Structures are given as structure tokens and as C-alpha cells.
């Protein structure tokens, strides 16, 4: 995250840190005690599917304070329409091997209904994006969880305001074109969370863009509202052998 601030410990309680062989991979969002939403592109280079760990209640990577909860990722579910190395349909649904325990530091973000998200949440201007990604383009990643407030744009407006891929109906732009504030590649999979009448909801996933906080370019986020039905149906399904599952979309 470029140009944000440290998220005070426990104020981003749905933030997930994904690890592969103990190394920082991506962010994610806890949506109930066993399911995490992340980006499909987070898993393009994975060979060690059994060394994939989700950490909840994380804040500072340098110290263990006892609020962290680690779980093995039992399943990674990706839409059939997602093509590795590309931008469209950038979403993954992760089943934890054992549920996390909800506490003051581990709380799920609400996955909203599609109608509510499209007709109300899509019009809330600002939303928060968070993660332990790059603090600067070509710079170090953060040791403390960072958060940034970003405004959402209508796709026609994003296309008009951008300098020099397509922005599909499965994406939306958010951020600033002045190069000061953005989420980065290391924040990939993390939440874009929207506040409405006292409650936070999942509206986007940190997905793609150019460099980080590049002048003339906005951050591009997976439009979660397009996937509500797809996610709900998978959450009602029985686990299948093998970590990676490709599921038909729609």
C-alpha cells in the first residue's frame, strides 16, 4: 500500500495474510470462520499446494503477539473463466482446513447480497484497501498492516481519466491518477471494504494495475458483486480431493 497509514491493530480484523513455504504471498478476506476470498492470480505460480497457509489476526510481521491464528488452506476454488497470466475473473475462494476462532482480532467481513451490492454499495464513493504490500514502487513491503481510503470510479470515467488491458464488467477502478496513493502487487487478493450504515462489506479484491501508484493509472479491483451467487453455491458444497478446484462460472 502506497500513501496510506498503519491500520491500528484489530481495526482490519478480516484481513488475511497468505504464506507459501513461510514467505509472504498475497492478502485475502475472511468472510466467515472457514472461507477466505482472494485473487485467482495469487496461485498462478504455486507448485507446493500443501505449504499454503492463511494467517488471521496478523498485524506486525516481526513479532508473534498471540492474536495470530494460522490454518492450512484445504481448497483453492477458481472460476473456469479465469485464464492464468491474465486479468479477467480474478477471484479465488479458499476453504480453511479448520475454522478460525472469532475474537476481537479475527472477525469476518460481510459478503453482501448481489442486489444490495449493485444498487447501494457500488455508489458508496470511498472504500478501504489494505495489505502488507510495497510501501513504494520498487520498494520494500510493510512490516505492519497498512490501509488506504480510495474513491471508486465508473468504468467510462476510469477509461477517460487514464493515460498509458480492458476494464471488464468483472472489474472496477479505484484510487488516484496523481501517483500518490494505491494498493500494490504485494497487496494482491486483499480486501476493498465498503462501509454502509455502520457495517463493512466486501466489494472488491486487490487485482491489477501498472507499476504501483503510477501517474495516469488507477488500481483495478475484482468486482465481487458479479460472484456472489458463484461463492454462495460453492460454500454450500462438499469439499473435493485435491487443493485446486476449477468451478464453472457462471
Amino acid at each position: 500500500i502506497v500513501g496510506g497509514k498503519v491500520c491500528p491493530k484489530g481495526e482490519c480484523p478480516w484481513q488475511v495474510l497468505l504464506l507459501v513455504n513461510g514467505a509472504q504471498l498475497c492478502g485475502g478476506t475472511l468472510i466467515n470462520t472457514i472461507w477466505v476470498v482472494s485473487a485467482a492470480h495469487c496461485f498462478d505460480k504455486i507448485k507446493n499446494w500443501r505449504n499454503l497457509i492463511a494467517v488471521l489476526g496478523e498485524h506486525d510481521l516481526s513479532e508473534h503477539d498471540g492474536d495470530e491464528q494460522s490454518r492450512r488452506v484445504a481448497q483453492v476454488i477458481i472460476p473456469s473463466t479465469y485464464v492464468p497470466g491474465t486479468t479477467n475473473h480474478d477471484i479465488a475462494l479458499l476453504r480453511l482446513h479448520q475454522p478460525v476462532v472469532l475474537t476481537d482480532h479475527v472477525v469476518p467481513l460481510c459478503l453482501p447480497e448481489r442486489t444490495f451490492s449493485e444498487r447501494t454499495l457500488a455508489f458508496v464513493r470511498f472504500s478501504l484497501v489494505s495489505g502488507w504490500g510495497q510501501l513504494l514502487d520498487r520498494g520494500a513491503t510493510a512490516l505492519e498492516l497498512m490501509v488506504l481510503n480510495v474513491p471508486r470510479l465508473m468504468t467510462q470515467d476510469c477509461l477517460q481519466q487514464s493515460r498509458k488491458p480492458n476494464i471488464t464488467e468483472y472489474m472496477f477502478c479505484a484510487g488516484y491518477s496523481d501517483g500518490s496513493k494505491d494498493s500494490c502487487k504485494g497487496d494482491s487478493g486483499g480486501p476493498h471494504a465498503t462501509h454502509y450504515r455502520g457495517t463493512w462489506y466486501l466489494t472488491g479484491i486487490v487485482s491489477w494495475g501498472q507499476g504501483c501508484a503510477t501517474v495516469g493509472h488507477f488500481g483495478v479491483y475484482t468486482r465481487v458483486s458479479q460472484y456472489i451467487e458463484w461463492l454462495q453455491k460453492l460454500m454450500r458444497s462438499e469439499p473435493r480431493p485435491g487443493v485446486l478446484l476449477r468451478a464453472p462460472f457462471p
Binding site: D104, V107, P108, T199
Partner: peptide, 18 residues
Amino acid sequence: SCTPTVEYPCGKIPILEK
């Protein structure tokens, strides 16, 4: 209006609620 029925309802921040 919606009121929580559980200790940790989704989309609410306990340290801020308390």
C-alpha cells in the same frame, strides 16, 4: 434495522464497538 445476535457479527470492529 439490524441488531447483532452473536458476539462477533460480520463487518463490525470489536475494539471500536467496545
